[PDB]
C-alpha cells in the first residue's frame, strides 16, 4: 500500500518535472515569434519604402522619449543589413528584403522545432496524467466494497 | 472526447474575442483619424508611420491609404463577428449535448 | 499556548503580506529609474548633437534587425519633444534639453517617493521580525528549565 | 433563502458595475491630468511655435492656436465625462444601500 | 550591530565588483577600438554612436574622443581597484573582529 | 577522513574548473558559427560591395576584400581557441579520473 503510493507519486512528481522542462520551451517560443515579428516589420518598412515615390523622403528620426529630429533619407534605394559577427552589408532594397525573408525563414523553422518539442512534452504529460489517473482508479477499488 | 472539442472551441472563441478587440479599436481609431485628416488643407504637412520609419506623406495619399485601411479592417470585423456567433453556436451545442448526456 | 502561537503567527503572517506589498514598490522603482535613464540618454544625445560641428550631419537611421538607412539630419538646431496628450512641440536644442531636464526632475522625485515607501516598509518588517523574534524567545524560556 | 438569494444576485451585479465605473473613472482622471499638463506647456509658446499632433497612426503639423483650442475642449469634455461618472457611481452607490437595507429587513 | 556593518560592506564590495566588470570590459573594448581605428586612412568613413543617434564623424575626431574615453575610463578603473581592496580590508576586519568575539 | 577529505577538496576544484571551460567552449562554438555564416554571406558580394564593420562603439565602412580577410582570420583563431579548450578540458578530464581512482584506492 506504501509501495503503490510511491509509484503513484513518481508519476505525479515527473509531472512537475516534465511540465517545468516545458516551461522553458514556452519561454523560448515567445522569443522566436517575437524576433520573427520584428524581422517581418523591418521587411514591412522596406517594402513600403520601395513604394513611396518621393525622391529623397523627409522623415522624423526618433531619438528617445517623445523626441524626434528632422531628416531625409538620402539613399532610398539601398539598405545596410546585418550579416552577423560585427558586419553588415549595403544592399539594394530588393536584395535586402530578400535576405530578410531568408532570415525570416530561419526563424520560421526554429519556431517549428520548439513548437514540436513543446508538443511531445504535452504528450508525455497527457500520458503521465493518464497512467496516474488509472493508478488512482484501481486504488479506490481495492478499497471499495458494496456493504453488508 | 466531446470535451476535447469544447476545450478546443473555447480557446477558439477566445482568440477571436481578442482579435475583435484589437480590430474594433484599430478600426474606430482609423475612423477618427480619417475623420480628422479630411478636414485638412491639401498642403498639410503630415508624417505617415511606415513600420519603423516615420516618413512625410501627402493629404491625398494619407486619406487614400486611410480609406483602404478602413475598408479592409471593417471586412475582417464582420469576419470575426460571424466566426464568433458560429463558435458560440458550437459551444452552446456541446454544452447542451454534454449537459443532456 | 495556542493563544500565544496565534499571536506569533499573526506577526509572521503580516511579514509575507507587508513584504509582498513591498514587492510591488521594488517593481515600480525599477521602471522609474529606467524611464529616467532613457530621458538622460535622449538628453545625452541632444547635448552631443549641439557639439557636432557639421552642417547637416550624415547619419544611419536604425529601422530594425541590424538594418539601417542612409540619411542626414536637416535641422540640427531644433527638436520635436513630446508635450504629452497627443502633442509634441518643436524647440531649439537648448529649449528641448531644458524641458527634458524638467521631466528628468519629475522622475527624480517619483523615485524618492517610491524609495521612501520602500524604506518604511523595510522598517515595518524589521520591527515585525523583531517583535516576533522576541515572542519566540520568551516562548523557549517558559518551556526551558535547568534539570534536576 | 429564495427571497434573499435573489436579493444578493442583484447586488452581486451592483457592486460589480460599481467597479467598471471607478476603473473608467480613474482612466478619465489621469487623462485629464495629462491633457491639462500638455495645455499649460503649449501656452508658454510663441504663436509661431511649430507643434505636431498625433492623429492615430499619423502625425500632423498643427498650430499653437489650433492645439490650444483642441486641448481646452478635450479637458472640458473630459471633466464633464468625469461628472457623468460621478453621477453614474452615486446612483449605483445609493441603489446598493437600498439593496443592503432591503436584505437586512428580510 | 557590527553585523549591520558587515552586511553593508558586503553589498558595497558587490556593486564595485559589478562596476569593475562593466568598466574593465568597456575599457578593453575601447582599447581595441582605438587600436583598430588608428590603422585607418584619414578619409575613412566612420559613424560615431552619439546616444540614440548614429552620426558620421572623422578619423581625427573619432580617435580624439576615443583617447579621452580611454583615459577617464582607466582613471575610474584604478578608483574601483582601490575601493575594492579597501572594502575588502574592512570586510576582513569585521570577519576577524566578529570571529574573535 | 583526513586523507580523503583533502582528495575530495581537490576534485571539488577539478570538476568546477571543467565547468568554466565547457561554458567558454560553448561561447567559442557559437562565435564560430556566427563568424562562418557571416563569411559565406560576404563571399556572395561583388568586390565593389559596400560593407560596414562595427569597431566596438563605432561603425567603419570597410571593404569585401578586407572584411573577408578579417573574417577568415577570426574563424581560424577561433577554431584554434577551440582546440585549446579541448586540450584544456581533456587534461582536467584525465586528472579527474586519476583523482577518482586514487580516492577509491584509499
UniProtKB/Swiss-Prot annotation, chains A, C:
CDD domains reported for this sequence: Prefoldin_alpha_GimC
Function: Molecular chaperone capable of stabilizing a range of proteins. Seems to fulfill an ATP-independent, HSP70-like function in archaeal de novo protein folding.
A Gene Ontology molecular function term of the record: unfolded protein binding
GO biological process: protein folding
Keywords, alphabetical: Chaperone, Cytoplasm
Quaternary data: Heterohexamer of two alpha and four beta subunits.
InterPro entries recorded: PFD_alpha_archaea (IPR011599), Prefoldin (IPR009053), Prefoldin_subunit_alpha (IPR004127)
Full protein name: Prefoldin subunit alpha
Organism: Pyrococcus horikoshii (strain ATCC 700860 / DSM 12428 / JCM 9974 / NBRC 100139 / OT-3)
Lineage: Archaea, Methanobacteriati, Methanobacteriota, Thermococci, Thermococcales
Family according to the record: Belongs to the prefoldin subunit alpha family.
Transmembrane domains' residue ranges: none
Curated annotation (Swiss-Prot), chains D, F:
Pfam families, per database record: Prefoldin_2
Chief location of this protein within or outside the cell: cytoplasm
Localization terms from the record: Cytoplasm
One Gene Ontology molecular-function label: protein folding chaperone
Entry keywords, A to Z: Chaperone, Cytoplasm
InterPro entries reported for this sequence: PFD_beta-like, PfdB, Prefoldin
GO CC annotation: cytoplasm; prefoldin complex
Self-association state and partner proteins as the record states: Heterohexamer of two alpha and four beta subunits.
Primary role: Molecular chaperone capable of stabilizing a range of proteins. Seems to fulfill an ATP-independent, HSP70-like function in archaeal de novo protein folding.
NCBIfam families according to UniProt: gimC_beta (TIGR02338)
Family: Belongs to the prefoldin subunit beta family.
Identification of the protein by name: Prefoldin subunit beta
Lineage: Archaea, Methanobacteriati, Methanobacteriota, Thermococci, Thermococcales
Amino acid at each position: 500500500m506504501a509501495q503503490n503510493n510511491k509509484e503513484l507519486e513518481k508519476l505525479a512528481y515527473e509531472y512537475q518535472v516534465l511540465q517545468a522542462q516545458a516551461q522553458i520551451l514556452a519561454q523560448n517560443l515567445e522569443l522566436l515569434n517575437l524576433a520573427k515579428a520584428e524581422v517581418q516589420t523591418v521587411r514591412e518598412t522596406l517594402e513600403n519604402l520601395k513604394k513611396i515615390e518621393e525622391e529623397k523622403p523627409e522623415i522624423l528620426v526618433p531619438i528617445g522619449a517623445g523626441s524626434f529630429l528632422k531628416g531625409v533619407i538620402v539613399d532610398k534605394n539601398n539598405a545596410i543589413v546585418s550579416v552577423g559577427s560585427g558586419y553588415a552589408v549595403e544592399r539594394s532594397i530588393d536584395e535586402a528584403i530578400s535576405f530578410l525573408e531568408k532570415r525570416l525563414k530561419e526563424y520560421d523553422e526554429a519556431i517549428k522545432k520548439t513548437q514540436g518539442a513543446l508538443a511531445e512534452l504535452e504528450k508525455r504529460i497527457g500520458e503521465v496524467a493518464r497512467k496516474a489517473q488509472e493508478v488512482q482508479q484501481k486504488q479506490s477499488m481495492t478499497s471499495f466494497k458494496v456493504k453488508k | 472526447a466531446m470535451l476535447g472539442q469544447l476545450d478546443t472551441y473555447q480557446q477558439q472563441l477566445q482568440l477571436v474575442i481578442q482579435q475583435k478587440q484589437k480590430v474594433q479599436a484599430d478600426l474606430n481609431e482609423a475612423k477618427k483619424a480619417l475623420e480628422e485628416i479630411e478636414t485638412l488643407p491639401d498642403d498639410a504637412q503630415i508624417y505617415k508611420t511606415v513600420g519603423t520609419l516615420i516618413v512625410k506623406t501627402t493629404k491625398e495619399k494619407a486619406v487614400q491609404e486611410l480609406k483602404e485601411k478602413i475598408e479592409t479592417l471593417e471586412v475582417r470585423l464582420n469576419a470575426l463577428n460571424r466566426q464568433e456567433q458560429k463558435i458560440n453556436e458550437k459551444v452552446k451545442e456541446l454544452t447542451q449535448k454534454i449537459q443532456a448526456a
